[PDB]
Amino acid sequence: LTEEQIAEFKEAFSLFDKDGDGTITTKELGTVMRSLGQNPTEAELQDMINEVDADGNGTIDFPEFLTMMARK
Amino acid sequence: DQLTEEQIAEFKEAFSLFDKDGDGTITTKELGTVMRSLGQNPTEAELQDMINEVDADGNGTIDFPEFLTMMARKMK
Numbered sequence: 001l002t003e004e005q006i007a008e009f010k011e012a013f014s015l016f017d018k019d020g021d022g023t024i025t026t027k028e029l030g031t032v033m034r035s036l037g038q039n040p041t042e043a044e045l046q047d048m049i050n051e052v053d054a055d056g057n058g059t060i061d062f063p064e065f066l067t068m069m070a071r072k
Numbered sequence: 073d074q075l076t077e078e079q080i081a082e083f084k085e086a087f088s089l090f091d092k093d094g095d096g097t098i099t100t101k102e103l104g105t106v107m108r109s110l111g112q113n114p115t116e117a118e119l120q121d122m123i124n125e126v127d128a129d130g131n132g133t134i135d136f137p138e139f140l141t142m143m144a145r146k147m148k
């Protein structure tokens with residue numbers, strides 16, 4: 001929501017994009033969220049995942065991550 | 073099956089295609105590209121696993137011995 005939050009989301013997302021392609025895997029998402037000091041359950045995570053991952057390929061880009069976080 | 077000289081030579085050649093400063097290290101961000109340069113096409117899940125295996129210290133950089141032994145394990 002704020003510029004602070006956006007920059008922090010961006011840094012965490014990038015920190016865990018291990019293959020450096022601008023996306024993170026669904027597995028990396030839980031870690032990214034814990035790195036932001038949040039604690040989603042698997043149930044929470046998986047719906048989030050199902051919502052962001054439109055093309056259903058197991059990865060999500062930053063715009064998708066960002067808007068998911070905004071809705072929460 | 074123990075590695076052949078041809079296999080080791082090709083893994084080395086591919087690794088070193090992406091070590092332009094010639095210090096024997098590449099980044100994990102390049103591992104996928106190395107694999108594709110060998111004609112392979114690891115899925116997002118396979119590459120996640122390989123990156124985990126080869127960068128055990130997580131500093132984001134990989135050397136040839138660690139890359140090679142990963143390939144030997146992965147061998148068909």
Ligand SMILES: [Mn+2]
Pocket residue numbers: 017018019020021022023024025
């Ligand atoms: Mn990625």
Ligand SMILES: [Mn+2]
Pocket residue numbers: 052053054055056057058059060061
């Ligand atoms: Mn996707």
Ligand SMILES: [Mn+2]
Pocket residue numbers: 089090091092098102
């Ligand atoms: Mn390079």
Ligand SMILES: [Mn+2]
Pocket residue numbers: 093095097
């Ligand atoms: Mn270097």
Ligand SMILES: [Mn+2]
Pocket residue numbers: 090091092093094095096097098
């Ligand atoms: Mn190097």
Ligand SMILES: [Mn+2]
Pocket residue numbers: 126127128129130131132133134135
């Ligand atoms: Mn390393």
Ligand SMILES: [Zn+2]
Pocket residue numbers: 047048050051
């Ligand atoms: Zn939902």
Ligand SMILES: [Zn+2]
Pocket residue numbers: 061063064
């Ligand atoms: Zn997208």
Ligand SMILES: [Zn+2]
Pocket residue numbers: 019021023024059116
């Ligand atoms: Zn990826």
Ligand SMILES: [Zn+2]
Pocket residue numbers: 135137138
């Ligand atoms: Zn080493």
